[PDB]
Amino acid sequence: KPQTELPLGWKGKPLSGAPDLEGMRVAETDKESHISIIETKDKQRLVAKIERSIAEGHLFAELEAYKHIYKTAGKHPNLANVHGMAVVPYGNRYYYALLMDEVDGWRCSDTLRSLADSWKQGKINSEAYWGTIKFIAHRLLDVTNHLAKAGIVHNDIKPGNVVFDRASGEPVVIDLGLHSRSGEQPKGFTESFKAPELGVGNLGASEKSDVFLVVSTLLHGIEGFEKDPEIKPNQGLRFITSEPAHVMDENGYPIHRPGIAGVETAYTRFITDILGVSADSRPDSNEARLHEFLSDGTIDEESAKQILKDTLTGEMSPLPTDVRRITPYYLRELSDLLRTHLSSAATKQLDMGVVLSDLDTMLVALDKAEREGGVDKDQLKSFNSLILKTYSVIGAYINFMLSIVEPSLQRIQKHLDQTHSFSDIGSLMRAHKHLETLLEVLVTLSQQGQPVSSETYSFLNRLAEAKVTLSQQLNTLQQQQESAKAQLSILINRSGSWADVARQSLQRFDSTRPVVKFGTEQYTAIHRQMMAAHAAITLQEVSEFTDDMRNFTADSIPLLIQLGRSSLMDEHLVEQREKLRELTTIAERLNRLEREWM
Amino acid sequence: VAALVVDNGSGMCKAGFAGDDAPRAVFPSIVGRPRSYVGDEAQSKRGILTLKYPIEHGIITNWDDMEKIWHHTFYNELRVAPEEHPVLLTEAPLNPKANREKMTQIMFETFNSPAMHVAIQAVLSLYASGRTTGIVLDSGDGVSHTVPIYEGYALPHAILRLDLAGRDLTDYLMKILTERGYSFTTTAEREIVRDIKEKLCYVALDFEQEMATAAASTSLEKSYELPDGQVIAIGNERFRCPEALFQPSFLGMESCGIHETVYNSIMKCDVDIRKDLYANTVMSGGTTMYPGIADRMQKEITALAPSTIKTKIIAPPERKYSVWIGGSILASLSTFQQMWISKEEYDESGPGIVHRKC
Ligand SMILES: Nc1ncnc2c1ncn2[C@@H]1O[C@H](COP(=O)(O)OP(=O)(O)OP(=O)(O)O)[C@@H](O)[C@H]1O
Ligand SMILES: Nc1ncnc2c1ncn2[C@@H]1O[C@H](COP(=O)(O)OP(=O)(O)O)[C@@H](O)[C@H]1O
Ligand SMILES: [Ca+2]
Ligand SMILES: [Mg+2]
Secondary structure, eight states: OOGGGOOOEESSOOOTTOOOOTTOEEEEEEOOOOEEEEEOSSOOOEEEEEOOTTOOSHHHHHHHHHHHHHHHTOOOTTBOOEEEEEEEEETTEEEEEEEEEOOOEEEHHHHHHHHHHHHHTTSSOHHHHHHHHHHHHHHHHHHHHHHHHHTEEOSOOSGGGEEEETTTOOEEEOOOTTOEETTSOOSOOOTTTOOSSTTSSSOOOOHHHHHHHHHHHHHHHHHTGGGOTTOOGGGOOEEOOSSOSEEEOTTSOEEEOTTEESSOOHHHHHHHHHHTSOTTTSOOHHHHTTSHHHHHSOOOHHHHHHHHHHHHHSOOOOOOSSOOOOOHHHHHHHHHHHHHHHHHHHTTOOOHHHHHHHHHHHHHHHHHHHHSOSSOHHHHHHHHHHHHHHHHHHHHOOOHHHHHHHHHHHHHHHHHHSOOOGGGHHHHHHHHHHHHHHHHHHHHHHHHSSOOOHHHHHHHHHHHHHHHHHHHHHHHHHHHHHHHHHHHHHHHHHHTTTHHHHHHHHHHHHHTOOOEESSOTTTTHHHHHHHHHHHHHHHHHTGGGHHHHHHHHHHHHHHHHHHOSSOOSOHHHHHHHHHHHHHHHHHHHHHTHHHHHO | OOOEEEEEOSSEEEEEETTOSSOSEEEEOOEEEEOOEETHHHHHTGGGEEEEOSEETTEEOOHHHHHHHHHHIIIIIIOOOTTTSOEEEEEOTTOOHHHHHHHHHIIIIISOOSEEEEEEHHHHHHHHTTOSSEEEEEEOSSOEEEEEEETTEEOGGGOEEESOSHHHHHHHHHHHHGGGTOOOOSHHHHHHHHHHHHHHOOOOSSHHHHHHHHHHOSTTOEEEEOTTSOEEEEOTHHHHHHHTTTOGGGGTOOSOOHHHHHHHHHHTSOHHHHHHHHTTEEEESGGGOOTTHHHHHHHHHHHHSOTTSOOOEEOOTTGGGHHHHHHHHHHHOSGGGGTSEEHHHHHHHOGGGHHHHO
């Protein structure tokens, strides 16, 4: 008789409003502690939070917290609705389990990722997005206030401990396991979200530390900290106002950097006024709700709830698996993985399956790093050398093997279908070296081991066909790059006649520090007249060169598109390409200066 | 004594006296009540108020708040007694008959106006251009309308409405700026982003070519000073924001741009009058104020129309007030003084009368 047929019981007297347990059965147990779903005969759907086997009474105290909040502050729609302590069947045993209503929907991380995604795709607008965010913050801060009335501090508010209800669109806080009473030392905490004071010294937990958590939880979701594991929400935002606070993709579109702000706004003031300040200077839950950010951009409560119902009944944006940027730390981490394979090859304990799988992810990481910035060319060449050294150890060392390596061939063949740029030259060379190493392994294992099967033989020729298509493509692009170098050098020669005169004139115009001002036309009139006069002087200084500069950019812009913005094998090409880009910016800014300032 | 002309928009209300070159009062169509003020004062005291727009997509939806805007317009902006001046109001194309009666009833019963007329907004912008035949693309804060007009009369079967206008562009600009690390989010910040939009955006004649330029170099970047002194720099956002007018997909809309919406309105008209509509495409409202929009509409409509036809776009310099100027012209005409609905006519026939006279 399986566990799905066994009954449940009560450990204490349950709470008033608790259901009858007769008929209830376990349906599944999900993914930490183990949570099982209890299907009732009616199907209300309950959650049973089973105790850890380590058994420090964290679970019984959690019940007593819920109990106490209900008696002192009342129930609250955005807080879990708990019924008591049950005994439930799990893993050939009965265990104690905290019994409560299922919040049927998604966790806060999944909801906010999905909300942000529908906004970027254009399914909802900015009013709706930021309205809904502010709506959530009001609910969470209302709950931290509700707990403060009971004299309970939560201590572990974070994305996993908030769950959204699909039916109502309401966020619900759960997981009081690490709760303390006010001014007692906290039972535990999560380090990425923790407020600085929380857990250190005489003064322990307060409502202030809860308010902090509520914000670090929102910041996490809003900025998308999951995409960048090297930062943690309780450090708040970094400001970059002199340079770009963003990265550019292939096509000139900026991309938000998680944790980086380019200007102070109500939103950045919210983060700084709470996360960037001590407990006594930090607002409590009701003051935080008065903040500019939460006071100003709000939408109707039913409007927000509606948007959240719609997000939750739609498709969940999946967790991004390898969109992580290639930083010196991550690239260091990947080198340490290769260093263990070389370490195990020396000791004759090299898993051949996993080194070829991991080498393929190294290739993708390196191609990714070349497209973006992030790491200097010396850290790349050292990584590249470490790959080549690892291919060196395989050849030197010496149909399950086919299934490991086919994914690698398919990825490369998908890459052979695409339209390439010059930044693909190094990418394709490396890919050729991979296919060659795959070919050598398979053929070599048939010498002293298992003979070649029909699948292997056909695979060898699929690798061989790809190697040649790769060679032809790699050879066309090297020819095209030589045309591009010559075209580059000619364009530079033309610039001689005007470059320095134009660079100087525009440097002087830029030192006046031109800028569109906020305000009325009357208020900005003197300012606008001053710029136009400066702009008129600059265009008079370069009059003789105006046709040259206009014709120069008709040629240079299409060439700069072709040479791209990423690293290239040829380092002289890159230094030259940047000199064209700088000359192009001078010419094109002067070609538009009248339109922009007069 | 001078007539009053008021043009009620989704974003802005424009008010003045018949005979003036421009309206004397321009303020936001916003009412704010406790958690009661109108216009800029409602915005300044937003912290203790819940702000609402009584006009949505050109059409009146909150009559209580609309009554407040008119009371504000007369008593605070124009500082006049509505019992002593006749009043010209404006309305959107395809305004429900029920709304027209409610408008009439409020002027006569709440404000005691001696007389009133109501006019279709697009038709006033065509009168303002010196025309009685033409097609109008009116685009404001809440709505865009292509209105073909023949010899004075709008052709309601060929009118198209597009819920894509300035408010949606301001909102889109707020989104795309967050990629540069700029998080504008409050209604105060929304107004600042509207300022940026109005001063930095333009329509590219060739979008893909400007995108290329913006990616190749930094020569389209341009900086803006916020009211607190902070400075931001923006790039392809400048021309990408108003491109949404031609590519509604940028706003998540599965819909035709203004160029193609205009084409379709012309095509719903009789073949015999199309040539004239094509040669008298007039443009109206603040959302048609983008540098480069007139040339783009010329390019884009010439692409869809027969090669025989001559496509001529008219784009008056001060066209955010074209509707109001039309009304000032019309009320000021001597021939028009017969057209007003009088207080006597309303006291004798009730709100229903409006449909007979307008
Ligand atoms: N120079 C400009 N460039 C771009 N947009 C502008 C400019 N000036 C005003 N706008 C925009 O035009 C809109 C105001 O235009 P208008 O007053 O004609 O609309 P409305 O009549 O209030 O609303 P609707 O016509 O939708 O009922 C606002 O959205 C504003 O941001
Ligand atoms: N009432 C509930 N409704 C829906 N999911 C729940 C509920 N209670 C817990 N969970 C889920 O179980 C997970 C872990 O439970 P939690 O109480 O946070 O235990 P722990 O202290 O081990 O983190 C949560 O992230 C959440 O997804
Ligand atoms: Ca209007
Ligand atoms: Mg948890």
